[PDB]
Symmetry: C2
Subunit: 704 residues, 2 copies
């Protein structure tokens, strides 16, 4: 009787008013008809009208009006289907009326049940490893995710507890079936069966659902750590490595961390804890040889799965090598179609390719048959363990020395213990692959620098822009002298122009002004102070180097300009684009001031790429200028335009230029050619032409 | 009593004499000690010595001597460990002696058991689809594999029979547990439990083991069929396609056929047959609403798994697109390390890359949470179906209107029915991928030719080698005239040399002598008969064309020479190598006469590659010669050597040469230049020099 009112209260409590707050013609009239029928049913209940009747009428009145509001709010433009389904599910009390075979309530219930049906129808060392990983499970200094880690370990402790405790309740169910040979207490056991067996995979899903956010934070932390640490400078270590393997080992390391911690806390610790707690549960059930023979079963299954996966891996390697060989022979016979047609190997090459197919497919049969013998001897000893355990329990129940009828517990319990063991055994090759993915990343975490930030690293006192060199040296190898004993002092507002030999000594000198490399001896100073005692970022924040190339990331053009200095608004972007003059290219381009460029976006011409580069350096606004002028010259409008923009960025600036062109070198303050690790001549253009040094030879080279 | 003798007979029958035939110091002395102890045990049994005693002594004598033979045969240089293990396993009868707590037998058994323990220790439209696939399950005309297909369908019918029938025997086991509340008949049920539950995965492994050889024959048949059919000639269809996609669609089609027939006969037909036979088993058990609610369970699980895999696939596509975008931005920020260091984006690019990582990882959380909601609502309605079914069976057993105690059958049977349903539901995307892999292959099976073998295709009456052209035309497109109205008759033992324009008209003319292409009109005949009425292979078996390039397959050099004609022995290979003169290169190469060459083997120089090509054509031995002389000339020793080998293969032969060199054209019978689809001049070298045609212009071009 009260169960119907409780079910009505539970149905009426489907967050009707609560959700209605939270979520904020013929079909609308059909809903208004249901709301009219619900108002009529509630007015019929009020007309029929004790506290249950008044509470029913109150629930009916609120639910009915909520239907009108829900329908009207959809007109002002899922959950109603859930409400109607939950209500129609609660209407299964009807059978309790039929069980009788007062009246006004039956008519009201019959009218309600029809009105709901209408609503639903209308709605339609390993110590170092463990210490480092226990540190790797610690996010940060914030109290909102350590609590979630506590939830994860709490459900992890709950899962094996329920996983061992609910087959005992199944045993209680069948035992009480024998002892009643009661329905109410049997239903109070069956509810534990329902909410227990509908909870194993459910609690595994909740575990993995919070494990997702655990992996989110850990992957963020390790990926940003290694991405910061691969942005240190060791260029000889850099350039021999391609970018693809360098970031592939990083992705393998973060998925190594993910798979490693998730599997070692999800399928290694819990299955060993499950086996241990099963044997100890038997040790509090009955201390006998049963735990020993079941322990023999699980250990034997583990050992055979490991050793036949070790049998599997060599067959997989041989099968991979044979399929690579046959597909290579196939495509390389297909490559020269014309000589395959020139000879009458039309019926021969199919025979030799079929021979290679047979030679691969035999090893394919061997590998798949090894899988067959794995699963075969596996299920054979599983059947033998079930047979031995089931016979010893059968002997026990027919001898009645323990509690009887419990054979279903020991029957399903071996299968339930075994079900994670192959789930482990398929990942023995995987955990060692995770180890070799994480160990190289651990080596990569903490390696080295090439330029070393000495203590006392301070700011760069940008007084005037006066750069002096004093008997300096350099090596990128042993005895490697691309630069040897040069010395100068370049002044503010003046310009050095540099030609070198056919070699990267010019760019190397440009990089050691930048301190992109190191010096073995000598003295390089900027504005009085040595370049090596200071912070690198405060050194290179006052430096603008024009590169000969120009990268274009897959992004838009205002972000590409703000790549010069990211603290800009769009006003300085447009002002720098009008300073360079490349804003008219943005007029010629579609997207306003956000033209998507790069590798897949909108491409560019080479002088315009250098115009985007010089616009980036214009936005960056240093005082120290270092141009890398291309040997690839352009049209004289493009040539004098890039020289005029170089003038507009270089006027009254401390400017240092490497170049091989004419207009740059016919006007500068001093022209230097630096070949074989030394300055080979010094002087202006008129000085080199009046002394006739190697500038005469390179004058013949620029002539032709 | 007799069980011990039967076990002794079964142990003695471990194929001791049978295998010993089939398979054909301190450890040897240890085995001789065991054989001496076994001779002593058998002599003790003969000394103790009725028919069982004489049969035991006979088994002991044969087994003992087999141990001496097995040990000695290993000295004359696994199974002995199996024999000793099977024997020591049979020695578990010992407990039957202990059960007593005659004598000579006990001492003999005690001495035997010790002797075995020593041996073991010492040893250590879909209608068209179904019709075509039912044809695709038919191998050939041989009676040894259709029988295996009958075995496959027999075990397939056996598997569902046992899979439904053995939980009824589990129900019999627990029912007889209740009705004995007998041990011998209960063991005669428990043996069915053992040999039945140790047979489900076992018969699945035997099925898949013979399915392996089924896949072997079907993959051989379909791969060789499509490999023959991709070796037809449609060159405009050929050249636009790369080899990799052409063979990748073939590998996808054969694995499509494999996965398609194996899954549609293994996880679609049997699981539907299992559901149907479960409901019909209930229909012969009790015809009620139980079959309807279980049918509701299985259908609801199927529908939700399908629709949330359809929910899954768009999340997988979006997650793939986002991970491609983030990894592309990451590697393209890493590409220009020097500008990343030139600007102070060292702390900015890590922030923008972390922003992209967050933007991808949110969709990663959404996809993995979609997997969570899949498994969650899955296990939720599985628990609801278990709850409804288990409660209705609980109501039935507490009301006793059926056979009681059967609740374990309906308990495990829903799980056992369900266990293949997700095994199907994970392959809904896979079967449609198999369909799109097989349909294009079906289109590729039967397409077309470009040169059509007309009926009346006969041999090539190789009388003299006289080739005539009569107002001929050609097109590889619409209105495409690289050749238009040329006509000649080249004689036996004489030589035409051909120069063309900067275009492939020369090679195209060379290919239409070969009938590599088709003609729109005209008349091309060889030795009186038209080239188009005949078989292609009998046309191109009397033709040797020197190609400008030379393919080298990943194989050895005698097979590379026998690529000219595969019917050769090694005598003609060596004779042709001495005819060309490239056998001294085989002397310079390591492997005798089998030097492994190709892409991974031993490489070559270009003139020597052409020497291997001309050795192939020398071995092929035609009369019709067609040289494709390279424009890339070599050293004058190499040049006059390849011209001298061309002379040695071309002397008194019907020879046609395309060339651009000098020594070929200063001696030939007639020199033709064919530009813009016409012969532009005719005559010998002295004729072109005495009339001064375009040979004057190309004389200036060869001069410089």
């Amino acid at each position: 009787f009260f169960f119907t009112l409780v079910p009505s209260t539970r149905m009426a409590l489907g967050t009707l008013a609560l959700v209605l707050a939270l979520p904020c013609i013929s079909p609308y009239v059909l809903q208004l008809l249901l709301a009219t029928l619900q108002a009529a049913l509630p007015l019929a209940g009020l007309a029929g009208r004790s506290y249950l009747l008044l509470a029913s009428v109150l629930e009916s009145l609120a639910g009915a009006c909520g239907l009108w509001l829900l329908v009207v709010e959809r007109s002002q433009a899922h959950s109603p289907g859930l409400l109607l389904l939950w209500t129609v599910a609660f209407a299964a009390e009807n059978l309790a009326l039929v069980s009788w075979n007062v009246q006004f309530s039956l008519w009201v219930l019959r009218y309600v049940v029809s009105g709901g049906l209408f609503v639903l129808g209308l709605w339609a060392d390993f110590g170092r490893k463990l210490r480092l990983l226990s540190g790797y499970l610690w996010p940060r200094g914030s109290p909102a995710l350590q609590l979630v880690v506590l939830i994860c370990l709490g459900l992890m402790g709950l899962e094996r507890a329920l996983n061992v405790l609910v087959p005992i309740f199944y045993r209680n169910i069948v035992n009480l079936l024998t002892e009643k040979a009661t329905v109410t207490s049997y239903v109070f056991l069956k509810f534990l069966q329902g909410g227990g067996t509908g909870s194993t995979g459910f609690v595994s899903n909740l575990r993995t659902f919070l494990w997702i956010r655990v992996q989110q934070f850990t992957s963020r932390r390790v990926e940003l750590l290694i991405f910061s640490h691969l942005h240190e400078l060791s260029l000889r270590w850099h350039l021999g490595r391609r970018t693809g393997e360098v970031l592939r080992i990083a992705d393998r390391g973060t998925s190594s961390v993910t798979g490693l911690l998730s599997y070692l806390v999800f399928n290694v610790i819990p299955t060993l804890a499950d086996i241990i707690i099963g044997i100890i549960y038997f040790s509090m059930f009955f201390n006998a040889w049963f735990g020993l023979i079941v322990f023999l079963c699980m250990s034997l299954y583990l050992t055979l799965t490991i050793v036949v996966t070790e049998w599997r891996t060599k067959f997989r390697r041989a099968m991979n090598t044979q399929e690579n060989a046959t597909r290579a022979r196939a495509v390389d016979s297909l490559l020269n179609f014309e000589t395959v047609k020139y000879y009458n190997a039309e019926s021969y090459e199919v025979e030799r390719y079929r021979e290679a197919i047979i030679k691969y497919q035999g090893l394919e049969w061997k590998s798949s048959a090894s899988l067959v013998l794995l699963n075969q001897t596996q299920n054979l000893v599983i059947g033998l363990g079930l047979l031995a355990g089931s016979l010893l329990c059968a002997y026990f129940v027919t001898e009645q020395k323990l509690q009887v009828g419990d054979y279903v517990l020991f029957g399903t319990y071996i299968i339930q213990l075994y079900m994670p063991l192959n789930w482990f055994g398929t990942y023995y090759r995987m955990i060692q692959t995770n180890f070799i993915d994480m160990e190289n990343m651990f080596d990569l975490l903490k390696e080295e620098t090439e330029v070393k930030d000495l203590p006392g690293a301070g700011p760069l006192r940008f007084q005037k822009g006066r750069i002096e060199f004093e008997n300096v040296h350099f090596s990128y190898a042993d005895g490697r002298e691309t630069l040897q004993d040069v010395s100068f002092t370049v002044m503010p507002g003046q310009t050095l122009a540099l030609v070198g030999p056919s070699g990267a000594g010019k760019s190397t000198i440009l990089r050691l002004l930048f301190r992109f490399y190191d010096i073995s001896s000598g003295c390089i100073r900027i504005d009085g102070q040595d370049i090596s005692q200071v912070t690198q970022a405060s050194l290179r924040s006052h430096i603008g180097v024009v590169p000969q190339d120009t990268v274009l990331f897959n992004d838009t053009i205002a972000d590409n300009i703000r790549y010069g200095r990211v603290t800009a608004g769009n006003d300085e972007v447009e002002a720098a684009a009008q300073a360079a003059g490349i804003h008219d290219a943005i007029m010629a381009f579609p997207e306003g001031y956000r033209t998507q460029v790069g590798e897949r976006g909108l491409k560019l011409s080479g002088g315009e790429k250098q115009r985007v580069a010089i616009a980036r350096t214009i936005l960056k606004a240093p005082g120290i200028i270092l141009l890398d002028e291309a040997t690839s010259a352009l049209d004289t409008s493009n040539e004098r335009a890039i020289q005029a923009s170089l003038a507009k960025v270089c006027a009254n600036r401390t400017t240092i230029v490497v170049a091989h062109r004419l207009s740059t070198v016919v006007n500068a303050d001093q022209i230097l050619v630096i070949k074989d690790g030394c300055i080979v001549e010094r002087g202006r253009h008129e000085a080199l032409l009046s002394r006739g040094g190697v500038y005469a030879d390179m004058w013949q080279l620029q002539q032709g």
